[PDB]
Amino acid sequence: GSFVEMVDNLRGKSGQGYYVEMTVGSPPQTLNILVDTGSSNFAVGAAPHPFLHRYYQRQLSSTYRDLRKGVYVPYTQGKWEGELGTDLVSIPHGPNVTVRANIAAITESDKFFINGSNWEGILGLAYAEIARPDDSLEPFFDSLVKQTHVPNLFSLQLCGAGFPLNQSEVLASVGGSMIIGGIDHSLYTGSLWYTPIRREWYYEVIIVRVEINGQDLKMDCKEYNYDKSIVDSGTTNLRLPKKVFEAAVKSIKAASSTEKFPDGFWLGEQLVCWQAGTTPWNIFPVISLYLMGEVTNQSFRITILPQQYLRPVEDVATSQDDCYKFAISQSSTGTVMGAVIMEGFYVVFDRARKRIGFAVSACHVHDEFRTAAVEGPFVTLDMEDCGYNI
Numbered sequence: 001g002s003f004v005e006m007v008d009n010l011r012g013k014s015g016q017g018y019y020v021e022m023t024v025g026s027p028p029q030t031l032n033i034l035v036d037t038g039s040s041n042f043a044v045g046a047a048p049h050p051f052l053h054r055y056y057q058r059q060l061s062s063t064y065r066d067l068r069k070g071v072y073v074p075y076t077q078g079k080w081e082g083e084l085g086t087d088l089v090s091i092p093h094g095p096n097v098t099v100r101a102n103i104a105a106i107t108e109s110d111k112f113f114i115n116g117s118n119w120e121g122i123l124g125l126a127y128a129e130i131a132r133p134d135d136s137l138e139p140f141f142d143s144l145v146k147q148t149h150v151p152n153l154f155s156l157q158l159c160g161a162g163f164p165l166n167q168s169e170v171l172a173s174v175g176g177s178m179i180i181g182g183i184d185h186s187l188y189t190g191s192l193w194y195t196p197i198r199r200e201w202y203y204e205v206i207i208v209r210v211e212i213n214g215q216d217l218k219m220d221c222k223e224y225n226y227d228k229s230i231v232d233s234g235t236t237n238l239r240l241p242k243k244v245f246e247a248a249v250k251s252i253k254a255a256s257s258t259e260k261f262p263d264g265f266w267l268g269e270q271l272v273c274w275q276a277g278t279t280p281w282n283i284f285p286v287i288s289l290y291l292m293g294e295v296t297n298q299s300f301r302i303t304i305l306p307q308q309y310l311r312p313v314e315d316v317a318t319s320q321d322d323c324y325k326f327a328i329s330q331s332s333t334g335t336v337m338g339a340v341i342m343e344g345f346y347v348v349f350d351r352a353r354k355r356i357g358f359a360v361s362a363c364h365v366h367d368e369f370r371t372a373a374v375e376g377p378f379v380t381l382d383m384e385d386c387g388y389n390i
């Protein structure tokens with residue numbers, strides 16, 4: 001481990017988000033910020049909200065600069081709206097630098113903040129193409145790299161506990177690491193395997209084959225990337241395109257057929273519970289996603305366990321049972337490799353070399369019989385055909 005100052009700098013969980021401490025303004029105002037590889041704005045609560053116990057107070061910062069421009073970000077779930085500006089930003093458990101960055105001061109929101117998440121803003125780590133209102137609003141990471149000697153790369157180790165964490169425990173537990181400017185070898189085992197970043201907007205990748213317990217899902221690979229496949233720390237679930245979801249659920253049901261689960265479970269709505277310590281991990285299949293390699297006609301695979309795709313939840317009766325929700329769901333906007341998938345791996349966002357690396361996480365949850373894996377190479381032909389084009 002060469003980045004001790006940044007190791008263990010994350011807190012949170014897959015259901016509510018993983019966050020890092022940051023400071024904004026002069027004198028510095030401390031805020032907890034969601035690490036989000038699926039968006040490109042640094043947007044912070046800047047007005048009272050029922051779920052915020054603190055927020056950015058621009059009038060108290062001598063370095064605040066008003067850009068005199070509004071920003072409106074509606075989405076299916078809800079929305080956020082605010083005022084654009086710039087200020088001095090630092091990451092206490094990060095590189096020892098202070099940068100001048102764009103900040104969207106959130107003045108109004110609907111279903112954006114989460115009750116008990118302990119974060120007050122989001123750090124959109126993706127590219128300018130998807131920044132709001134447009135690509136002229138330089139994202140935080142672009143500012144950081146341009147203004148300092150920090151290498152153009154970051155890596156994330158998100159650590160799922162493997163069991164529920166109550167309010168007190170989730171505040172006291174280490175949720176993972178965000179290594180800014182490098183790769184820390186203590187965070188993974190085995191080798192790192194890289195997949196190309198297809199295009200710089202979201203962290204877009206190409207899935208070339210899918211297996212459930214080694215059984216090929218056997219769909220046209222374009223289906224797996226319809227209309228895109230992305231790596232998103234800001235999404236809880238593994239989200240799959242409608243047809244892929246239907247095929248994967250049928251195969252997962254068939255593999256786990258010795259136990260019948262209600263439809264509500266497969267829809268990610270209802271929990272399933274087992275007597276303490278008796279979760280039948282072995283009946284559930286492993287899932288392998290093959291990703292395009294850096295070498296022509298070569299792929300590698302990442303394999304996840306049900307310990308990743310079954311999200312631990314506290315029982316309705318706070319009983320002694322071990323309960324979970326199915327953390328694979330359908331999408332109409334392509335595949336999303338969310339937090340539950342990222343929890344199995346140390347993920348390297350190598351922006352400098354336009355590639356994403358995967359290695360087995362030193363903190364992935366497993367059992368005595370199976371582990372997550374990152375393996376290769378595999379001979380795979382016509383992988384460019386797996387990518388979707390509008």
Ligand SMILES: COc1cccc(-c2cccc([C@@]3(c4ccccc4)NC(=N)N(C)C3=O)c2)c1
Nearest residue numbers: 014015016017038039112232233234235236339
């Ligand atoms: C595991 O990450 C989590 C868990 C729970 C909530 C959020 C969360 C909360 C608020 C926003 C987001 C968003 C978002 C970002 C910008 C604009 C609109 C939405 N970030 C993201 N990747 N997705 C899918 C969102 O909905 C994500 C993240």
